[PDB]
Scaffold this active site. Structure first.
Site, short mmCIF file in Angstrom:
data_model
loop_
_atom_site.label_atom_id
_atom_site.label_comp_id
_atom_site.label_asym_id
_atom_site.label_seq_id
_atom_site.Cartn_x
_atom_site.Cartn_y
_atom_site.Cartn_z
N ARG C 6 124.10 2.97 16.91
CA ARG C 6 123.15 2.07 16.31
C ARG C 6 121.83 2.77 16.24
O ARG C 6 121.45 3.55 17.14
CB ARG C 6 122.98 0.79 17.14
CG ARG C 6 123.96 -0.35 16.82
CD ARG C 6 123.97 -0.94 15.39
NE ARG C 6 122.65 -0.97 14.76
CZ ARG C 6 121.64 -1.67 15.25
NH1 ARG C 6 121.73 -2.43 16.34
NH2 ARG C 6 120.46 -1.49 14.71
N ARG C 62 121.68 12.12 1.39
CA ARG C 62 121.78 13.28 0.53
C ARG C 62 120.94 14.48 0.98
O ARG C 62 121.17 15.61 0.53
CB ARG C 62 121.36 12.91 -0.91
CG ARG C 62 122.33 12.07 -1.74
CD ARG C 62 123.64 12.78 -2.07
NE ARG C 62 124.24 12.21 -3.28
CZ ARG C 62 125.17 12.84 -4.04
NH1 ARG C 62 125.65 14.07 -3.75
NH2 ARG C 62 125.57 12.25 -5.17
N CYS C 74 125.50 0.19 2.02
CA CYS C 74 124.37 -0.57 2.53
C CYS C 74 124.71 -2.06 2.43
O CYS C 74 125.72 -2.44 1.81
CB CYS C 74 123.09 -0.25 1.70
SG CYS C 74 122.64 1.51 1.52
N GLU C 77 120.21 -7.19 5.55
CA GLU C 77 120.08 -7.78 6.86
C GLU C 77 119.85 -9.26 6.69
O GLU C 77 119.33 -9.65 5.65
CB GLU C 77 118.89 -7.17 7.58
CG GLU C 77 118.70 -7.59 9.03
CD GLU C 77 119.98 -7.66 9.87
OE1 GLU C 77 120.48 -6.63 10.34
OE2 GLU C 77 120.48 -8.77 10.05
N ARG C 89 118.28 -0.28 9.61
CA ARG C 89 119.15 -0.22 10.78
C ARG C 89 120.40 0.50 10.31
O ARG C 89 120.72 0.41 9.12
CB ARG C 89 119.55 -1.62 11.24
CG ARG C 89 118.48 -2.33 12.03
CD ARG C 89 118.93 -3.77 12.17
NE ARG C 89 117.98 -4.59 12.91
CZ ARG C 89 117.08 -5.41 12.32
NH1 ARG C 89 116.97 -5.53 11.00
NH2 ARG C 89 116.32 -6.20 13.06
N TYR C 107 116.04 4.08 18.40
CA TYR C 107 115.13 3.09 17.88
C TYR C 107 113.77 3.74 17.74
O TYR C 107 113.14 4.12 18.73
CB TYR C 107 115.03 1.89 18.84
CG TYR C 107 116.30 1.07 18.86
CD1 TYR C 107 117.33 1.38 19.75
CD2 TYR C 107 116.44 0.02 17.96
CE1 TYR C 107 118.51 0.64 19.73
CE2 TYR C 107 117.61 -0.72 17.95
CZ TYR C 107 118.63 -0.41 18.83
OH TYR C 107 119.80 -1.15 18.80
N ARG C 115 115.58 -3.24 21.11
CA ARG C 115 116.48 -3.20 22.24
C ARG C 115 115.82 -2.25 23.20
O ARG C 115 116.17 -1.08 23.21
CB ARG C 115 117.85 -2.68 21.82
CG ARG C 115 118.76 -3.72 21.17
CD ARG C 115 119.15 -4.79 22.18
NE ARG C 115 119.73 -4.25 23.42
CZ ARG C 115 121.06 -4.15 23.63
NH1 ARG C 115 121.95 -4.53 22.72
NH2 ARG C 115 121.51 -3.68 24.79
O1 PRE Z 1 119.08 -3.68 17.66
C1 PRE Z 1 118.81 -4.26 16.61
O2 PRE Z 1 118.95 -3.73 15.52
C2 PRE Z 1 118.28 -5.68 16.68
O3 PRE Z 1 117.46 -6.12 15.93
C3 PRE Z 1 119.05 -6.62 17.60
C4 PRE Z 1 120.37 -7.25 17.10
C5 PRE Z 1 120.90 -7.71 18.46
O4 PRE Z 1 120.45 -8.78 18.93
O5 PRE Z 1 121.74 -7.02 19.05
C6 PRE Z 1 120.08 -8.40 16.14
C7 PRE Z 1 120.09 -8.21 14.80
C8 PRE Z 1 120.49 -6.89 14.20
O6 PRE Z 1 121.26 -7.08 13.05
C9 PRE Z 1 121.30 -6.05 15.14
C10 PRE Z 1 121.34 -6.28 16.47
O1 PRE Z 2 128.33 4.72 -3.70
C1 PRE Z 2 127.76 3.74 -4.19
O2 PRE Z 2 128.37 2.71 -4.45
C2 PRE Z 2 126.27 3.81 -4.46
O3 PRE Z 2 125.75 2.89 -5.02
C3 PRE Z 2 125.44 4.92 -3.80
C4 PRE Z 2 124.90 4.57 -2.40
C5 PRE Z 2 124.46 5.93 -1.78
O4 PRE Z 2 123.31 6.32 -1.89
O5 PRE Z 2 125.27 6.63 -1.16
C6 PRE Z 2 123.75 3.59 -2.55
C7 PRE Z 2 123.82 2.27 -2.25
C8 PRE Z 2 125.10 1.63 -1.80
O6 PRE Z 2 124.86 0.76 -0.73
C9 PRE Z 2 126.11 2.63 -1.30
C10 PRE Z 2 125.96 3.96 -1.50
#
Ligand code: PRE
Ligand code: PRE
Ligand code: PRE
Lengths: 114, 119, 118
Positions: C6, C62, C74, C77, C89, C107, C115
């Protein structure tokens, strides 16, 4: 093999207490059913529907003893027309030898419809 | 090892009919090209950009015979200025021997733009 | 075993430049701390809070040589009232023998508050 264990639950109100209470209920239940040990969990993802805002579901994982080191992060569930409102879903990835057709995925509260 | 396989597709309309047709098509090309068995799939995540609302894409997985035991969940793709619209992307985690550089990742429809270096 | 790692960091502004540099810098630190070599990465997921729209953080991968074949995607959140703003994250999943409690989670920036124990 490592396998994914699904879970889902709905809250009644959007509060910190309600979201963390029903999410901890869900995870305890998955753990019980599948006898999951914290160190066999690769990671966990928790998603919430876009109407829930008061607290992250993931804070509930740190209420469980021994789950301090399981990597968790949340994401947002997609908003689907006619979807289950106020739903919290989980994807737990565990090391396991149990067949896929035998994993116990846990569907609680209004998500019993699954 | 376990290795993730990536795929991406687009639909021209937000409707149940097209999303389930185009997600089914995508999963089938990935399974074929990668010789994926349902029982080797650790899990599968599907995302959609925030302009798709008729059906969870994940509902196509059950139309794939033998896949009714694969763990799936959907999430929202982040809203980036200029990102591809009405796009469903998949991350399938599988147990395979095939090395990283020979994992055949699959882009279909307008998604052929997203990573041409994997073609 | 395969284990998840993480990481989290914040940008000051929603810019393509700052998102790519701070994401690069986080990933470089996870790799450094955990000795990650690209072929050990099963996959990687990046999320950003609903206030970042300039670029997809995955584009930062890249600039890491040898990482062209790491599967990345991606997601958004969830939007929690009072959550840390402008946050990126990552959940990196790696082939490893390191113990769960010895994995170095990273972090950076304002995310150090998230955390304080990891
Ligand atoms: O560590 C993080 O990224 C946090 O913000 C904490 C936390 C958690 O409570 O464990 C909450 C939300 C995030 O999506 C991931 C984890
Ligand atoms: O591979 C894909 O589907 C893309 O859109 C490219 C890419 C990347 O930069 O690697 C960008 C955004 C998506 O969340 C996943 C990957
Ligand atoms: O299992 C659930 O929780 C569902 O609502 C089902 C379903 C699906 O239609 O396949 C839809 C949304 C979830 O993100 C994952 C799977």
């Amino acid at each position: 093999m490592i396998r994914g264990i699904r879970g889902a639950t709905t809250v009644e109100r959007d509060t910190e207490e309600e979201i963390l209470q029903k999410t901890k209920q869900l995870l305890e239940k998955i753990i019980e059913e599948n006898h999951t040990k914290p160190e066999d969990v690769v990671q966990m993802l928790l998603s919430a529907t876009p109407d829930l805002h008061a607290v992250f579901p993931a804070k509930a994982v740190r209420e469980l003893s021994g789950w301090q080191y399981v990597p968790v992060t949340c994401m947002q569930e997609m908003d689907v027309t006619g979807g289950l409102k106020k739903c919290i879903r989980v994807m737990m990835t565990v090391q396991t030898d149990v067949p896929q057709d035998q994993i116990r995925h846990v569907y609680l509260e209004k998500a019993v419809v699954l």
